[PDB]
Design a protein around this ligand. Sequence first.
Ligand SMILES: Cc1ccc2cc(-c3ccc(C[C@@](Cc4ccc(C(F)(F)P(=O)(O)O)cc4)(c4ccccc4)n4nnc5ccccc54)cc3)cc(P(=O)(O)O)c2n1
Ligand SMILES: [Cl-]
Ligand SMILES: [Mg+2]
Length: 289
Amino acid sequence: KLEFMEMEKEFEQIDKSGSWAAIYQDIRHEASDFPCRVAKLPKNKNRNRYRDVSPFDHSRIKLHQEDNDYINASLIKMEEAQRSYILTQGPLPNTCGHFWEMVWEQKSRGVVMLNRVMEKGSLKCAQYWPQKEEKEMIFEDTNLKLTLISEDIKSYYTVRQLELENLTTQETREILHFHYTTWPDFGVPESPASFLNFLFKVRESGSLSPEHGPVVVHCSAGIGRSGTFCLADTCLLLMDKRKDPSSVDIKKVLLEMRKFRMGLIQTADQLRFSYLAVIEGAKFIMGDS
Ligand SMILES: Cc1ccc2cc(-c3ccc(C[C@@](Cc4ccc(C(F)(F)P(=O)(O)O)cc4)(c4ccccc4)n4nnc5ccccc54)cc3)cc(P(=O)(O)O)c2n1
Ligand SMILES: [Cl-]
Ligand SMILES: [Mg+2]
């Protein structure tokens, strides 16, 4: 069906009128506003990487510990697409244990990292996983042990096989770590192809499967790149699920996502990239393999 000629015609239109920003800002100013009282509690101050980026109280992930159940993480649940994601910030030196605790408690199978531990001079993210097989990490506060089993390093991303062990229950689970290493803060991936190839890799690993807990997606703040990634995936699902792919309104989908976590997708160009990714990705999937 030459239906994909409309989407591209529309995309080229927006591109022609250069109205990406207008569209993006319109979305920002219609975005939901929900309370984040827990995130702002004084005792949770050192658990937030950024002052103004917090999870809404209603969709926040709660740690199953009694002392403090707080972690800057939100559950994004997309009904029609039938997929959930947990979006969180790059773990801080004092929240790495909380991060794996969440991964464990939520029964996540995969972790999607879209930033780097070193981005333009600043840490922006703690080294929350082991870089050497022989140097496993133990998080004494959450009583978890993490070991690197192997890693497949590619040009634009790295996939690591990790073993996460709950020292209390003595159980172990294999966690897949999908790390896209070439996506700058407030930037876009190297290309629609590298991004899509990364996304497909995550998908085929079954990490996004309903049989597992939600995938944990993070970047530095957990909204810009994580938002772009999730939006693209979700819209790709809706294009493959609806008889009329062109009926998928990415703007409306972004708004829906912003009801679960603030600031999803940080720049007009990330929104444009989302469209490109979705349109091209939809062509590859609907296309003949
Ligand atoms: C209803 C509501 C409520 C709160 C909101 C907050 C922000 C909202 C608020 C702040 C910021 C920028 C950020 C965090 C941030 C970092 C990296 C990314 C990234 F894109 F690179 P990523 O890929 O890692 O995600 C995304 C966000 C910041 C920016 C640059 C450097 C350091 C810190 N920051 N955070 N606190 C700050 C205090 C002073 C100065 C800057 C601050 C963005 C969105 C935006 C919105 P809005 O879009 O709806 O208007 C909000 N809306
Ligand atoms: Cl850090
Ligand atoms: Mg309007």
